[PDB]
Design a protein around this nucleic acid. Structure first.
Lengths: 23, 66, 41, 95, 83, 99, 110, 98, 84, 108, 96
DNA sequence: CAGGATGTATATATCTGACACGTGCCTGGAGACTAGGGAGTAATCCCCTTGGCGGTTAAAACGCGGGGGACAGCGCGTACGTGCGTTTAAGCGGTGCTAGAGCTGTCTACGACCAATTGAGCGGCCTCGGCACCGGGATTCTCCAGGATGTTTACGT
DNA sequence: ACGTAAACATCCTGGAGAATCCCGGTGCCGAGGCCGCTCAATTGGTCGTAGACAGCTCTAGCACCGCTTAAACGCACGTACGCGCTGTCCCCCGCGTTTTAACCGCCAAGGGGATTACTCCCTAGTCTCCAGGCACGTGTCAGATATATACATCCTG
């Protein structure tokens, strides 16, 4: 996925989400 | 002019007063002898005055029992 | 007070010591126990 | 007069290339310009330090790529350097 | 015209709102003074560097650029003010 | 007979409302007056731009909110819900501000 | 004279000002000399970074059914990505707000 | 027979290790670990003798400073035993975890 | 290959105990000897990545003390003693 | 004519000339001032004198006549300003400041 | 027999003998002090360079160094430093 | 343990308009096209530092076992922090109004770049002694458990 | 009401390791003298950055007045805090006993670094042209407000 119009390929598919550690 | 000594103690003082004179104020109010009191603002010696320690009104003083 | 022979005066006098912040040990107790301390004191 | 250099037009161009049906606020544009300037300064400073490493007086693509690798974390770096390489391998292709 | 007792301007409900945006539920009463002291210390630290930059620039007003660059000095760089 | 809300549940609505929004929370006039009062000692008869005071507002609010995020972590750690000043002090110490 | 001039950005296939990046590198005295490919690499990296950030921001904005990118969307796009949050760990965004999130214990039980 | 009260020898060890300044991690296992972890990044890598020493000594300081912070967390929770949650929360507040 | 125990068991229980005592903690739980190992591995990966990157850029095939100290300085932990 | 070193005419021991050369070759600006190396060398000399005096006092306390990096760490970490300046610095073989939390210590 | 290295060891030893006439310094401590001098010099010089780029200037005059040292060192340290620095510059004005 | 009511939210449709978006002008900055020359590029070699080998052997790691101090859970009392109603002190805004001070163009001149000379300040190279390590004894210093003197119930009347 | 005994309760203390003081032998490494050399101080020119100065104007500070709004105050009230009690259980401190880190020595050689010749990429400089910044002018299609409803919580047999 990602990409879009003139940005075909490249980008970062499935980026890492923030963790937000809970105590 | 007022300060707060931590139990929490309220004592009226003067800029030129010494620690020992302030130390006697706890004895009158709380009954704790000055020799068993160690005052924190660094330890403050009896001879040095409040102004020498840069103590102003509503200063943060701490009392720990010996 | 500082001195330093060759470095007469100048430099810094009476540096501030490190705070070394302490955890929850303020000698704080109940007033009833504190009241008993006054009788002993 | 008194012109002010900015990355506004280029940021808008890449925005329209990546999202041809959306806009951007003036404050958002200013934030993006500040981010671009900060990242440029960071990468260029790291490249300068890397040049001063090996007693080299010049800045080439090699150490700017190394600086990008050092700065950008994880997969992002593995993308960016690759992208950068493309921009070079075609730049020398056509003059 | 000098100013005094100006740290009371940050009122109790404002501090409660800041804490709520922080992500808390209950606030002890003693917080509304320790956090005022924290804000005063932080403002001192930032304002000192901003004033230093302004004094070096041989100018009598503190511009936004000096403030944001003082913020960047302390590892708290701020976007959105023409950095 | 009058409708009363149980304590602790209005705070959740408030937390959602102030986390969803993005505007400034401290009043502008008191903060500007405070900034002038604290900066007047470093250099007498100073002057601030409109953006200069606003920039200090955003920096202070972001720092205070981020500190309260770490303060809540400390208070939650002690197996409690409320936050004490010692939570703020320990959060500052761990960050290295008051070490 | 010469032929028709054309920008180095066209040669590099970018719309970022490689020429302006080269001028900034020269005038910023980072090094005594700068290579020809260094501004190209810097422009490409800046282009990729701003493209990723803008794409995430636009995705968040379209999620919030708002077609104009405001500073609020920038934090929603940056901090929601772990790599971008790590890149901007010590960065505060004006009018960015905070991420809606509450600790699990603070939430009431069943 | 003689037996110290559980908890007093710990202060003895604390004072002994704080007064002294030697290296508390065995040099050979740490060097072997360093070689193993750097093998993944680039195979056939040689390490300077003072490179590993700097790596280990800097690593030791970070762990010691981390344990000072995680000790503060344990006392703050009204305890004396440091726990994994203490280390995790100290790291999170320091800004390394998230 | 040294991928038998990953050599991380080299940093053993008494070593962690000594490090913690130097830190200044009275009592240590038994579940920390793995958390500390994980933290050590993460920190060493973080530092050695930069050190090896510095070595790779310099076209040399050995990791010198300069690369390690300058990687540490870049990460925000300056280290005096091995040059600089 | 007879040449006297710039440090002597500035009343310094740190090398003002070497500092000027480092400023010039360090690529900090197109040009550098005449008084900038003097100011920088004086500041470096003052800082070094301060930390060395503190370390020597620590050594005199520790019944030693030569300075060990442990003395440098003890000196730097016992001064609030110096420790704040060196807050992100790990001194080689410096150890740590000996201190204990009050809770851990026995009450009496 | 070649590739001479530059270090502040001689100068650090000289100032040490200026402070404590009867105290030596080990090689490890000498390296600590040399690295500290290098780090502080780099910090001040880099901040002065950025602070000269600030006002579109090209010269790192004494004012830039003074402002950087007043803006890097904390507390009275910085104050003391600038005083010392000014004194040195004054000597340069006196002897020419 | 399922029904009802509420002040909280969801959506819809209107204005309403500051405001990103085209659109010229043109100018300062970028590009094209020459020489010029050091900085980097290759190739060689020389220590040499790095890795790997093999015996002690003793220090440190490892395993085991009793137990005691700490961790954790549950319970009870309260004070203090929250939710809500009522002023009210003050934020916010809208509009003149002044002058300090930020920008900007000019002249000049003085401080910095640089080049050729010259000497000495500082770097490396041995070199000697003395300061710090280490070994061990005697010495105090800490820390432990234990018999011993107070104390306020908890039973009795 | 009221006797004495009883478990706790804690200053006092004997004795078993632990940390110091001192004494002494011994290396290994600072401090220093020495030779040299490469680099900093002199002196001269030239030249362009930055002080000043003068002017223009941006806007920062100041004020006034309505309005309306969050703040301050009080007040029931519940509920989270903090102390206490108890019951596990799991690190602790030693005691054997297994392991291997550290040391010392030897050896092979990979490559870090210094030298030397080359070449070609970056800079300086001219000249010319055009992309981006600025000022106009928008026509808007993104931002509020007036309503229609679902519903999470706190009552109910």
């Amino acid at each position: 996925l990602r990409g879009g119009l003139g940005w075909e390929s490249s980008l970062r598919q499935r980026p890492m989400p923030r963790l937000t550690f809970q105590a | 002019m007022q300060i707060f000594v931590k139990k929490t103690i309220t004592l009226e003082v003067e800029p030129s007063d010494t620690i020992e004179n302030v130390k006697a104020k706890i004895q009158d109010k709380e009954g704790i002898p000055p020799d068993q009191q160690r005052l924190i603002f660094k330890q403050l010696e009896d001879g040095r005055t409040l102004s020498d320690y840069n103590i102003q009104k509503e200063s943060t003083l701490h009392l720990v029992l010996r | 007070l500082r001195g330093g022979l060759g470095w007469e005066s100048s430099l810094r006098q009476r540096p501030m010591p490190r705070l070394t912040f302490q955890a929850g040990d303020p000698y704080y107790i109940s007033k009833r126990k504190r009241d008993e301390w006054l009788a002993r004191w | 007069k008194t012109r002010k250099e900015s990355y506004a037009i280029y940021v808008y161009k890449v925005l329209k290339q990546v999202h041809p049906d959306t806009g951007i606020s003036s404050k958002a544009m200013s934030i993006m310009n500040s981010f671009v300037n900060d990242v440029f300064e960071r990468i260029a400073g790291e490249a300068s330090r890397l040049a001063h490493y090996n007693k080299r007086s010049t800045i080439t693509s090699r150490e700017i790529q190394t600086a990008v690798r050092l700065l950008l974390p994880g997969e992002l770096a593995k993308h960016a350097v690759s992208e950068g390489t493309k921009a070079v391998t075609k730049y020398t292709s056509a003059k | 015209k000098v100013l005094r007792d100006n740290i009371q301007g940050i009122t109790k409900p404002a501090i409660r709102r800041l804490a709520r945006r922080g992500g808390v539920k209950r606030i002890s009463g003693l917080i509304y003074e320790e956090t005022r002291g924290v804000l005063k210390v932080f403002l001192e630290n930032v304002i000192r560097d901003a004033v230093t930059y302004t004094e070096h620039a041989k100018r009598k007003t503190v511009t936004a650029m000096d403030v944001v660059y003082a913020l960047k000095r302390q590892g708290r760089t701020l976007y959105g003010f023409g950095g | 007979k009058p409708h009363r809300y149980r304590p602790g549940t209005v705070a959740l609505r408030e937390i959602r409302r102030y986390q969803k929004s993005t505007e400034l929370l401290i009043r502008k006039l008191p903060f500007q007056r405070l900034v002038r009062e604290i900066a007047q000692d470093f250099k007498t008869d100073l002057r601030f731009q409109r953006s200069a005071v606003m920039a200090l507002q955003e920096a202070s609010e972001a720092y205070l909110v981020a500190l309260f995020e770490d303060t809540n972590l400390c208070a939650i750690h002690a197996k409690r819900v409320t936050i004490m000043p010692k939570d703020i002090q320990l959060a500052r110490r761990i960050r290295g501000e008051r070490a | 004279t010469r032929a028709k001039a054309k920008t180095r950005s066209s040669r590099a296939g970018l719309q970022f000002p490689v020429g302006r990046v080269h001028r900034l590198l020269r005038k910023g005295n980072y090094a005594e000399r700068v290579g020809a490919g260094a501004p190209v690499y810097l422009a490409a990296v800046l282009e990729y970074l701003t493209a990723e950030i803008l794409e995430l921001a636009g995705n968040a904005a379209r999620d919030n059914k708002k077609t104009r990118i405001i500073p609020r969307h920038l934090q929603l796009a940056v901090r929601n990505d772990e790599e971008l949050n790590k890149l901007l760990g010590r960065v505060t965004i004006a009018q960015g707000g905070v991420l809606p999130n509450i600790q699990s214990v603070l939430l009431p039980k069943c």
